[PDB]
Write a protein that binds this ligand. Structure first.
Ligand code: CDL
Ligand code: 3PE
Ligand code: 3PE
Ligand code: 3PE
Ligand code: 3PE
Ligand code: PLC
Ligand code: PLC
Ligand code: PLC
Ligand code: LMT
Lengths: 89, 69, 92, 49, 469, 179, 168, 81, 67
């Protein structure tokens, strides 16, 4: 409950206050999902329940597919522009 | 002579019939506003077939002593 | 820095107060900071099999929640089919 | 007579091929009243060729 | 039926060249029509609001969801005819509006994600379906990768939609941490009063609502609808809003929220005010979609909101298609083409359209006055029902803000009509090319419904008083 | 009614308005264009701090004061508070007429906001849905939302007043012949 | 192997104005009880889809000139049209079972089928390969799934005992 | 009368004044997402501001509601001035 | 009534065909058979709503009868 909230908050703040590049944005998204899964698995242990672990495995699947789609979209941007500059999207 | 109006009586009856039907629609409207926002049954709301809300859980380590009422 | 600090404090205290059901605000956080007491672990004898978490996940995911599995298949179809459409130019 | 006006009576720019030039890039008008295309066939003529 | 469509199309499209894409779109168009005709009798199951739970307790099927399903299909048989029937058989209109190979698959997958949301009964199905609807619509924005603006658009929409999926999952995991449940049926008057879940559920509503452009995070979605191609803008702008608003209406989460009241007020003000200086069409119509999202947000606070929502979402969708269709037809009669993807950008390019095609402007006026809420057009009977519900439940300041927002929005809605009925030199006198038959008949049918569908209002009320009561 | 505490609420309101000024200052320093730093927050900010503090002070001070002077709780108080707030905000533009206009129109809007109940929410029990409605049954007092076929005459004479055609007894029966 | 319910259900719930037969009918009974109206609707959709694209090509051809669509699209057209027709007929029969439409002939056929099975000693609705808990899970997954026919197809194949009739 | 009222204050409380009022308010609404240099960090900062503002606004209006009102008047000024 | 409904729904259908012809900048009498097709199609739609409403009125009447 602590570690997950902390990674989530710090990664949201590093997503919001990133004036540098974009890979930090991808990373902060993945870390936010990680912290969520840790919150949920801690609660699932304390309750001795399974719905939490089910939603966790589902998050892992969905996050991996998220990164796949995001890194195809980036490749499209790069196709057209040739450089992913610090302040472009 | 060419003045051939409908009588007073037939006019009053027709207006009364109209007002009666309008009052009928009024009562139907109130009655439906009441029929909605009235509590229903679980079967009409969630599940006609498995109408027992009570959740039976897993079975792989069913512990006698875990049922309760 | 000022916005980073304000956002840090508020988001942390809210993310901690949120998990509790007390009505007074300050007590919602002082409940989160109550990690003081140990949890007893008793041993029973009702579990008969060698079911672990992965077996349970398979059982519920493939019986009770089959629909989500048969939708994740389509999420993965998107993971295949979108990146192709984006990267691969079907000029022919 | 015709000078293009807006929903509020404000002045509006008449868009042509005139201001897709390289002179009107690198300005900081908002996304609403910018008028630079970036995808016109005047700028994207030599495009990944 | 969607699934067998999506499954069959994958094989049938991989087996098929780039030259069959229009015919394949036409096929799935007719197939969806046959579904909507032949399987529509299933509305009988929902007599007396008999509600069904399916796949355990993951899905829920009632008259609300079924009507939304028919509407999404009616939208998806009109949005497909726009890709599968060429307007004019000219080289320009071949280059301007040509479908890609994978587009139709992504449309149907987005239909599926839309329907899994409204039909959801558990948060797990919601999270899986909103990710499906979200990922499919990242790709739809990005499929036209030969444009710079669309590339920028998909990237921003990915990041700012990912952030909101994080917010949604954080809210769900909090609800589960509190209550050990993923199902909202496990709430009731006792549990609402007894537990402090207000924060935990508004965070759900906001994480869903900021994905549809609710203020003050409207700008990013407006930049997207402007920067993307027009025939994609007409889909992305509508279907995601229907799905998420319908899920939030069906689940009576935010009965009397103060935060929602504030934000909905801000949407009506922003979407009415900020759209006045706009010279571009798509930003104008996006701010219009925002203020209508404000009006429809105002019935998340009611607990009896089905009729008002269903009537407004239907006329909104119809007017939204019809106006974008008028803008598409008018490309023939303008003088300057701005792009291969957005041939028409500025409102001042529709000048003199009355002197070219007048009945296109008649349709534009009917549709505009429908947006404004002029009777006897359907928009009146839709905004009337909203006013009845909010005044019946105790929102008065918001009704005044609603009236004020309608007046302010008349101005950016009438900008189109004013420039259209203006005069122009170099008029059209003859043209041997002719627009397609189907797209004309579709536009006409939407116009005739916006105009004359007030005739059936009692009949709709009777059917509603049976199947929804 | 129960009186208001003017200074207690005003001090809370001022600290709140100062805090909101700090938040908006930092948010502007982050969202702004040109080279900035941690110094610019309170230098280059367009009076967000004094805006928020003066408004919250003037609004709450005037509402509690006029609630205590009028000795009531109603919408006229919120009108006076919006009138003060419009003065403060319009003093920034250094013109008399815009100051008067900002005052009157901010006052009318807050005064309407107090008329409708001084809330963006709803009461949810004073509303028509959750309250008695329709025709009252048998001679019972007519509430707000209730409808009546025939009203008492004493209640009419009190709510309206006598004269201008409206009287305690009808005119014919009053002038009937005692025969 | 016991085929005895684990969880209570409703007895003779009325989904419509007419009586009930089954609430989760097996695919076999739904296909064997089909009226000719259902097979005609199958062939109606089977012919109406390819005819629909021919009608459309007549209205707005794909090029400048009318040409009849290629047999490739016609074949795929016929397959999907049979699928639409079967889904409609599987629904029309299922609703005759639920009690939403006229179900006289289906009532009598089930009363005859069931009495014959009781005479032969067979379990009504049959015997299964599964444990009863999976039977209940199957009925919970598969009951009233035809309401989702616009989205997905789902079908009962398990021979569970949780049909919505009295114990006998 | 004809000038100072019929064509003066009564156009100011109407077409002329509402036009000027909306000219500014629209030009301040849209000049909010100021820099197009990077649309991402800006909308991201807008998320953080809104979340923080709602958490703090709800905090204030739990304890007292007649104090948050001027906070909202001033916010509307900041957004529309 | 049924017949009044069908003529009206056909009247909307002629308006769709006419408005479609005009949007194409054709004469109103371009392809007359389209008037007949639009008539029967919308007539079927009005007929469907006619039967839906009839079934619903019967249902509420049946509710009163079983009372
Ligand atoms: C066409 C089939 C024709 C037919 O009637 O087949 C009968 C046949 C059984 O024949 P039988 O010997 O007479 O036994 C009769 C009872 O059914 C036997 O009763 P039982 O108790 O012994 O059942 C044993 C088992 C027997 O099952 C098996 O083990 C057979 C395995 C077959 C593999 C596939 C071929 O049945 C099952 O458990 C099947 C579970 C069904 C799961 C639901 C699947 C329906 C969905 C299909 C559409 C796809 C879903 C898309 C949704 C996506 C979500 C977004 O059952 C099947 O064919 C199952 C096919 C499932 C394919 C889908
Ligand atoms: C997603 C990206 C990943 C990052 C995630 C970051 C963590 C997320 C934090 C939580 C989720 C975000 C919530 C978004 C804001 C909206 C919250 C909300 O609207 O809930 C309001 C709700 C009451 O509203 P309502 O139900 O509508 O009306 C009835 C009122 N009785 O319920 C409430 O009443 C709210 C409860 C009031 C207490 C709020 C807690 C504030 C405490 C902060 C104190 C800070 C200390 C002072 C200042 C420090 C600076 C020096
Ligand atoms: C730290 C110590 C804490 C102490 C405890 C008490 C703290 C209370 C704090 C209260 C909240 C203060 C938040 C202040 C608002 C955020 C500041 C801001 O600048 O908002 C606007 C923001 C940036 O705009 P800016 O860079 O200044 O450029 C202006 C040019 N237009 O751009 C944005 O888009 C963000 C907008 C955020 C809006 C939040 C939601 C407000 C809801 C509007 C209310 C409308 C209701 C009234 C309607 C009446 C109808 C007539
Ligand atoms: C809980 C309480 C909440 C209740 C709401 C309280 C209301 C608070 C309102 C404050 C929020 C900020 C909005 C203020 C308006 C924004 C623009 C402005 O500041 O007004 C000035 C404008 C300037 O006119 P001018 O002097 O000619 O131009 C030079 C300006 N530097 O002025 C003019 O154009 C001339 C004004 C003439 C008077 C016109 C009166 C019209 C009244 C009907 C308004 C209806 C439209 C409402 C618009 C809403 C916009 C937010
Ligand atoms: C029967 C509907 C009327 C009709 O048939 O339309 C015919 C059309 C004129 O057709 P006509 O000129 O005579 O023949 C063309 C020669 N190639 O006449 C028209 O142009 C019909 C246009 C009017 C239809 C308006 C909708 C009528 C609704 C009535 C209810
Ligand atoms: C449904 C397709 C929508 C696609 C868009 C086309 C509009 C069709 C509206 C018919 C709705 C209905 O007839 O139904 C009435 C519904 C509930 O009835 P139901 O349970 O859904 O049964 C319907 C069974 N059908 C599908 C076989 C017929 O009441 C409502 O709240 C709907 C409010 C909609 C207002 C829009 C009016 C538009 C004018 C229509 C002139 C023909
Ligand atoms: C009082 C109504 C009123 O005063 O309405 C008059 C004004 C009309 O504005 P306008 O001058 O014609 O806009 C200029 C449009 N042109 C330039 C295209 C012609 O309404 C409004 O501004 C908005 C109404 C706000 C309602 C409060
Ligand atoms: C199902 C729809 C039934 C047909 C209908 O009611 O629609 C009638 C319209 C007829 O249009 P048309 O102008 O006569 O086509 C002219 C074609 N020629 C010129 C080749 C003859 O069909 C459509 O165009 C598209 C239907 C959507
Ligand atoms: C411009 C026209 C449209 C503008 C929109 C507003 C129209 C709607 C009317 C607002 C009605 C407000 O009415 C609200 O206050 C009245 C008192 O006056 C209250 O009425 C109640 O007041 C109490 C006294 O406090 C008395 O017992 C009274 O008999 C009644 O029960 C209700 O709690 C509520 O109905």
């Amino acid at each position: 409950m602590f570690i997950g909230t902390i990674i989530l908050v710090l990664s949201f703040l590093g997503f919001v206050f990133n004036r540098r590049n974009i890979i930090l944005a991808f990373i902060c998204l993945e870390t936010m999902l990680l912290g969520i899964n840790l919150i949920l698995l801690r609660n699932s242990v304390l309750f001795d329940d399974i719905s939490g672990s089910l939603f966790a495995i589902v998050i892992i699947i969905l996050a991996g597919v998220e990164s796949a789609i995001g890194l195809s979209l980036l490749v499209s941007y790069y196709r057209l522009r040739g450089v992913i500059n610090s302040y472009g999207i | 002579t060419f003045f051939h109006p409908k009588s007073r009586e037939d006019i009053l009856n027709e207006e009364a019939k109209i007002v009666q039907a309008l009052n009928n629609q009024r009562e139907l409207t109130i009655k439906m506003h009441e029929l909605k926002r009235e509590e229903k049954d679980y079967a009409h709301s969630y599940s006609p077939l498995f109408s027992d809300p009570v959740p039976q859980g897993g079975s792989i380590g069913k512990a006698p002593g875990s049922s309760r009422e | 820095l000022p916005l980073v600090l304000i956002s840090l404090i508020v988001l942390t205290i809210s993310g901690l107060m949120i998990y509790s059901n007390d009505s007074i605000l300050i007590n919602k956080l002082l409940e989160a900071f109550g990690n003081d007491y140990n949890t007893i672990i008793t041993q029973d004898w009702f579990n008969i099999e060698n079911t672990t978490l992965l077996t349970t996940i398979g059982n519920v995911l493939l019986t009770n929640n089959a629909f989500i599995l048969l939708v994740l298949a389509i999420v993965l179809l998107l993971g295949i089919i979108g990146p192709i459409s984006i990267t691969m130019k079907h000029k022919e | 007579d015709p000078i293009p006006s807006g929903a509020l009576g404000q002045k509006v720019p008449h868009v042509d091929e005139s201001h897709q030039d390289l002179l009107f890039r690198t300005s900081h008008m908002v996304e609403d009243l910018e008028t630079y295309d970036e995808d016109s066939p005047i700028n994207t003529s030599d495009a990944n060729t | 039926m969607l699934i067998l469509a999506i499954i069959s199309l994958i094989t049938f499209v991989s087996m098929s060249k780039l030259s069959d894409n229009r015919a394949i779109i036409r096929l799935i168009n007719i197939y969806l029509i046959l579904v909507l005709v032949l399987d529509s009798f299933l509305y009988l199951l929902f007599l007396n609001n008999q509600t069904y739970t399916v796949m355990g307790e993951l899905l829920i099927f009632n008259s609300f969801t079924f009507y939304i399903d028919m509407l999404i299909y009616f939208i998806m048989i009109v949005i497909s005819s726009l890709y599968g029937y060429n307007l004019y058989n000219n080289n320009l209109y071949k280059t301007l509006f040509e479908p890609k190979k994978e587009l139709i698959i992504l449309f149907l997958i987005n239909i599926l994600g839309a329907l899994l949301i409204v039909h959801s009964n558990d948060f797990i199905t919601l999270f899986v379906a909103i990710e499906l609807q979200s990922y499919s619509i990242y790709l739809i924005t990005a499929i036209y990768n030969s444009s710079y603006k669309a590339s920028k658009a998909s990237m921003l929409y990915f990041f700012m939609g990912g952030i909101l999926s994080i917010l949604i999952a954080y809210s769900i995991n909090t609800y589960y941490s509190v209550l050990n449940s993923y199902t909202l049926h496990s709430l009731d008057s006792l549990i609402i009063n007894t537990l402090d879940l207000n924060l935990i559920l508004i965070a759900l509503s906001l994480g869903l609502l900021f994905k549809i452009g609710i203020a003050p995070l409207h700008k990013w979605l407006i930049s997207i609808y402007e920067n993307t191609p027009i025939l994609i803008t007409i889909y992305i702008s509508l279907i995601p809003k229907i799905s998420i608003l319908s899920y939030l209406v069906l689940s009576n989460i935010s009965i009397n929220s103060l935060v929602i009241s504030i934000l909905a007020i801000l949407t009506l003000l922003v979407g009415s005010v900020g759209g006045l200086l706009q010279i571009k069409i798509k930003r104008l119509l996006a701010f219009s979609g925002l203020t209508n999202a404000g009006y429809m947000m105002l019935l998340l606070l009611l607990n009896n909101n089905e009729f008002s929502y269903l009537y407004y979402i239907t006329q909104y969708s119809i007017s939204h298609l019809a106006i974008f269709m008028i803008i598409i037809f008018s490309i023939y009669y303008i003088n300057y083409i701005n792009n291969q993807y957005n041939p028409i950008i500025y409102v001042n390019q529709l000048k003199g359209l009355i002197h070219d095609n007048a009945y296109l402007v008649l349709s534009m006026a009917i549709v505009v006055f429908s947006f404004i809420g002029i009777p006897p057009l359907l928009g009146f009977f839709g905004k009337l029902n909203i006013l009845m519900s909010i005044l019946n439940n105790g929102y008065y300041f918001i009704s005044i803000v609603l009236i004020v927002a309608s007046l302010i929005s008349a101005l950016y809605y009438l900008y189109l009509l004013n420039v259209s009925i203006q005069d122009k030199n170099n008029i059209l006198i003859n043209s041997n090319e002719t627009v397609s038959s189907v797209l004309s008949y579709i536009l006409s049918s939407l116009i005739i419904l916006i105009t004359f569908g007030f005739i059936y209002n009692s009949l709709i009320i009777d059917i509603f008083n049976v199947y929804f009561n | 009614f129960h009186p208001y505490n003017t200074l207690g609420l005003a001090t809370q309101s001022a600290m709140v308005g100062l805090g909101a000024g700090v938040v908006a200052a930092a948010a502007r320093n982050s969202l702004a264009t040109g080279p900035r730093n941690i110094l610019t927050t309170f230098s280059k900010s367009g009076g967000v701090v004094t805006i928020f503090t003066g408004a919250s002070i003037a609004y709450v001070f005037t509402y509690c004061s006029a609630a205590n002077l009028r000795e009531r709780k109603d919408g006229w108080n919120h009108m006076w508070a919006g009138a003060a707030t419009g003065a403060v905000l319009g003093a920034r533009t250094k013109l008399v007429p815009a100051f008067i206009g900002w005052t009157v129109l901010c006052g009318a809007a807050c005064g309407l906001f107090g008329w409708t109940g001084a809330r963006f929410n709803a009461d949810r029990k004073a509303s028509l849905e959750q309250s008695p409605k329709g025709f009252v049954q048998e001679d019972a007092h007519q509430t707000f939302w209730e409808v009546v076929h025939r009203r008492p005459l004493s209640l009419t004479v009190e709510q309206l007043g006598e004269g201008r055609g409206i009287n305690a007894v009808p005119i014919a029966t009053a002038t009937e012949a005692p025969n | 192997s016991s085929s005895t319910p684990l969880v209570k259900t409703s007895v003779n719930y009325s989904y419509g104005d007419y009586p009930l037969i089954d609430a989760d009918p097996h695919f076999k009974r739904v296909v064997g009880y089909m009226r000719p109206s259902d097979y005609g609707v199958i062939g109606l959709a089977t012919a109406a889809l390819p005819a629909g694209i021919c009608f459309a090509e007549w209205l707005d051809p794909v090029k400048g000139k009318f040409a009849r669509p290629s047999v490739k699209f016609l074949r795929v057209a016929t397959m999907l049209g049979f699928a639409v027709g079967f889904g409609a007929a599987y629904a029309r029969s299922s609703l005759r079972f639920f009690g939403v439409t006229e179900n006289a002939r289906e009532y009598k056929k089930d009363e005859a089928q069931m009495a014959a099975r009781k005479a032969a000693g067979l379990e009504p609705y049959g015997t299964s390969s599964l444990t009863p808990e999976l039977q209940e899970i199957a009925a919970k997954n598969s009951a009233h799934s035809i309401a989702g026919l616009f989205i997905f197809p789902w079908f009962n194949f398990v021979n569970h005992p949780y049909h919505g009739r009295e114990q006998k | 009368i004809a000038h100072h009222v019929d064509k003066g204050s009564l156009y100011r409380l109407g077409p002329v004044g509402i036009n000027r009022l909306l000219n500014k308010a629209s030009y301040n609404v849209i000049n909010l997402s100021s820099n197009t240099r990077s649309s991402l960090s800006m909308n991201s900062m807008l998320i953080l501001i809104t979340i923080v503002s709602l958490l703090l606004l709800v905090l204030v209006m739990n304890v007292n509601f007649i104090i948050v009102i001027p906070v909202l008047i001033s916010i509307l000024y900041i957004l529309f001035s | 009534a049924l017949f009044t409904s069908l003529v009206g729904a056909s009247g909307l259908g002629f308006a769709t065909k006419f408005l479609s012809n005009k949007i194409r900048l054709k004469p109103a009498g371009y392809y007359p058979l389209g008037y007949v097709f639009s008539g029967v199609a919308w007539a079927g739609l009005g007929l469907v709503l006619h039967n839906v409403h009839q079934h619903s009125l019967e249902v509420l009447e049946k509710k009163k009868t079983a009372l």
